[PDB]
Symmetry: D5
Subunit: 156 residues, 10 copies
């Protein structure tokens, strides 16, 4: 609750171990998150080193993955966040989300200031979820919802 990391490599190393154990057990993130009470994106993010799990969720997911005591502890620590290796993703799947920022980043800024005003949409007071929908033209689409609080800049 008050313990925090200053070096992302410890939690990212743990994430690698979790993913191998996860693959050996043929688990999905959905089922690791099941029974946790937390959204699959939050639990996934914690496993990947970017969130802290409450001790209860940490023990549960720890049991599904056969994690030792130190690992379960580590998952509860407030991480040094930052999942991109070197600022810009190389992975195509992650790059596409960077690309939407290169295409729509100033549009998001302009529409945030138009609809809300001066300030930010929070990445902290924030939820995300990923939804699969059919494409009427065929195939499938991802509907990803970014739900952040508006925080105004206020003069003083």
């Amino acid at each position: 609750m008050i313990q925090s990391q200053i070096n992302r490599n410890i939690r990212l190393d743990l994430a690698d171990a979790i993913l191998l154990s996860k693959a050996k057990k043929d688990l999905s993130f959905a089922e690791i998150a099941d029974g946790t009470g937390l959204a699959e994106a939050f639990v996934t993010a914690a496993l990947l080193g970017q969130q802290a799990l409450p001790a209860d969720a940490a023990r549960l997911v720890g049991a599904k993955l056969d994690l030792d005591e130190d690992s379960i502890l580590l998952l509860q620590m407030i991480p040094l966040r930052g999942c991109i290796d070197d600022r810009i993703p190389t992975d195509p799947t992650m790059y596409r989300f960077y690309e939407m920022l290169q295409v729509y980043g100033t549009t998001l800024k302009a529409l945030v200031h138009e609809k809300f005003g001066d300030g930010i949409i929070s990445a902290i007071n924030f939820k995300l979820d990923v939804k699969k929908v059919a494409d009427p033209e065929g195939g499938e689409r991802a509907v990803i919802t970014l739900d952040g609080k508006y925080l105004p800049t206020k003069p003083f």
Copy 2:
């Protein structure tokens, strides 16, 4: 439309002039897009240099903003896309969306592969929506919907 740009600075300089004109006329992006048949995010992105407008939309927004013939032409050209000055935004409003990537980038990758499979969520066959919703704890929230086609990696 077969005409395209190779230097983002031309459309970005145009964007600056559009924004001054827009500020002098006290126009909103919602207003500028009304009548085009195009979503405000698409029209905004085009004004900010990140999309091409079809000829009819360009004429109509050019009328609202008092643009000359060359500016109306430039709005129709396929842009050299990339709205971030130097890869990482400095602007807090813009930066928060990059931070969502630093926190959740690997989670989005993980969940895309879990829900869809190997491949990408498209930034091209893609729709963006920004809604303002009340926050039940007070204040306002932005609900940003990313709607991208899933394209699977094809083994061959």
Copy 3:
């Protein structure tokens, strides 16, 4: 209000013009902010391109600095913020504040998580001021107060 910039160079150019007028008129920032009802740091930051002034304060500082209508309008527009040229300051005076980050950044993180919890000290819901005090050993000290709202990360 609703109008925002996407290119910081416009307001930073304006800032340079403001600084020359200010020096020619022998004005202090304290003098310029007097009568705006806004703190010297906020007004200064707006002059330097990093905040928007409300219309009345914009007109008043515009009167003191002999600014034209466009400039007074630009001062009200929401900026593309980011005052550092290329990520790390070269200026010794500005660099010292980056050095405090290099020496204390992980301490600030550690102590914020210890005293507040998982989350951030906001730079948006934020006040700062700069006070000159006597040094008991001789000379003077700056006491810079950063007053930022704590925003918790909560799971979802």
Copy 4:
């Protein structure tokens, strides 16, 4: 004391081990610093590799954390300072303090020169402390005090 480091990884690796020990013993930084006669920010910074502890303080914190002789000696050596992994923090909590510089860096410069003159506010002859205060609109705020000697530029 006359001994110093040239590679920050040694002290930073030590910091990682310290943080694990600290988390396993559920210690706060306040607790570790109590009895040293040193402020919590200074002691914390030392644990995190950014300050040297005096021999007595090093023994004392070394006792509280089960550190070996070599680790206690390491805490006394003058560090190679620099806590940010790669110039710009990725972690949201530390990033906000960088953002404070991106928004107010030039304002801090301007006001330091106005109030003090040509020179710097020291990061070396320097104290900081972090205060939690209640926010009258609800929630909490961090009052972070940066207290640095003013050192004027000497013409010669």
Copy 5:
């Protein structure tokens, strides 16, 4: 297949081990890929950490390369793609393909927009082929076929 990697080093370290075993056994990539039902470029890319192999191909190449159970599993996992160490290749053989981008990048953009329209040529719905042909002037030429689906940008 729903298992994916978030750290390219794991698969890249495996690639190194694969290449040593491949060299000791005097195998070619064409030989490894034979019987797999998959193109040599796709199988090679998988070995080098950039594609996932289906289970039967993974087992077959694992038999040919004398890989352990864990390595054969890692070959099936969806990778964190990105084979270039630090954005720009240093290796002359790889650099030449980057140099074709530096010379023809804008030409490819221009001609894609001319022939197909606004949008992209996919790197995902994509096949590549490398053919050796005689050079009429003596020596040999590589004919590398990039076969990518066109994906239009659509207004919305």
Copy 6:
């Protein structure tokens, strides 16, 4: 042709003017190259500042685009090549070709070494073709042919 540039901005500025003229005349690159005897990709590259045109092709395309004498001369000068603004493209259309390198770069190296031996595929002794083909799945594909001389590394 012995005249060469050392600063790409000159030819890239020229490219921008060409593209504007080309758009006003509603010309395709295919049409511009018709009658030069040069492949459309080579002529396009020259217009975009990455190749030199022979004098007669330069006059021909210069007539078609109504270029002045200095522009026609600049088109003949050997360029300072490099069409990417800052090493990595921001534009999605050009990015995909960089991504093919991030995915297949080491595969191309491996297969070049297997099929040809130690050395490089040339970007200089090189031809490229962009072909549109129907996709049996529906839609269209780009078949891009990179045709490069193999130059071996030889011991000395």
Copy 7:
């Protein structure tokens, strides 16, 4: 004197104009500094945008260089310091001083901590002097004296 710059380009552009004027009048820096009562390195640094001249010195050097009133004013303002274009000098003469840092930077740190203790040698309370002296083995040597106040790191 309380007026300061935030954009180094104004004073650097002024420095370029000064250097051309200086070259046209065939003045040395020593001559320009003579009569100001200030050391040649200080006056020179001011002309090059890195120091503020006192009003008397400014008018004196401005008379020598035929600077206009605005330029004399600019020389008096506290600069945004930072004379290196992009962090690492490309110029051989400037680079050697950087190389001195690459070879002896950690030695300077070590010996400063040995002889003085934990702290810094100031670049602010600082004088530098360049002397020409004969090399006994023939040729000349520069004896560059860096004379910086030692400021200790203060615990608290």
Copy 8:
């Protein structure tokens, strides 16, 4: 001595070992250099990976530091020099010497060309020396003497 290194990490790792041993033995760099016949800055630099020690000095300091044969041999190797981790020091103590270049770099260039001519002050034919002197204002100063051979750029 004809043996040279190509990877600075070997000698820098050795430097770290040396510094630990030196600290345990409570040795000063002055002591370690005593009796080598070499200036303390040279011996220090060699220990820190930036110079080669002659065999007699290497044996002498190796005795004082209890180094094994391989270490004593490594100290004699010509190093791959470069003591700064990533181009710009983060350490305040080392940073000040970089700041000296950011403030006076162009002044050093200017005055070298004025006093000596076109060319460089050598970092190779080069002596440095650190003296402590009393400050008349109280406290201490470092007089750091850079003594470099001038090498002219001569036309050919």
Copy 9:
């Protein structure tokens, strides 16, 4: 000659003007350097902003290119050297010399220390020339001679 530049853009802008004049007059660099008494590489370098010409050569090459008095003056000024735009060339022709470094840089270091000892091959006391020779296998070869003084690192 004691006048020096601190901003390379002045001389590089001059180089661009020189090159257009040179192309218009269809001059070669051999012809321009003829009669100056200086090697073609030295005079070319000076035109391209990387060397200072002596006054007579500057007048001579200035006459050939109809340069005004200011330009002839600029050619005599000691430049701020550095011809690469951004550290790594993009142009294939220049990149090959960088690649030569990437392939042979450590070999050059190794052989310099083996043949000469600790020290450097000077880029200042240095000559280069470029010779065209026939390739007995057909075609042409460039024989580029780098001729630099060895300066040893000597202990002190």
Copy 10:
């Protein structure tokens, strides 16, 4: 040889081991190369990771250095070339060759296009050697000969 590497660290680690073995045996690169039939620069480059040795030469140099069978195999593999740690060398000896590129890089481009035409001097069909010669004014010089095939840019 059809086996190739994708990760430069394998061969560079091996190069470090070779250098230690070489130093213990006090071998020069000249004697290691003796009897291979290969130039000392080529053999050295291979040992340092930048070339592949033929099987015979690998077994010979491996006998001289006591290399195991896997190391001898590795030396035969086509490397992932790139000897500079991070794009720009820090080592003064290596840096000087980069500085030659910073001073003469555009001169080399200009003279190559003048003497050969549009194209490149190859770094692949390429030889180098390093010759020691006496300086008439005392001391020694390195005469480094770069011998590369000219390859013309081919239109199509």
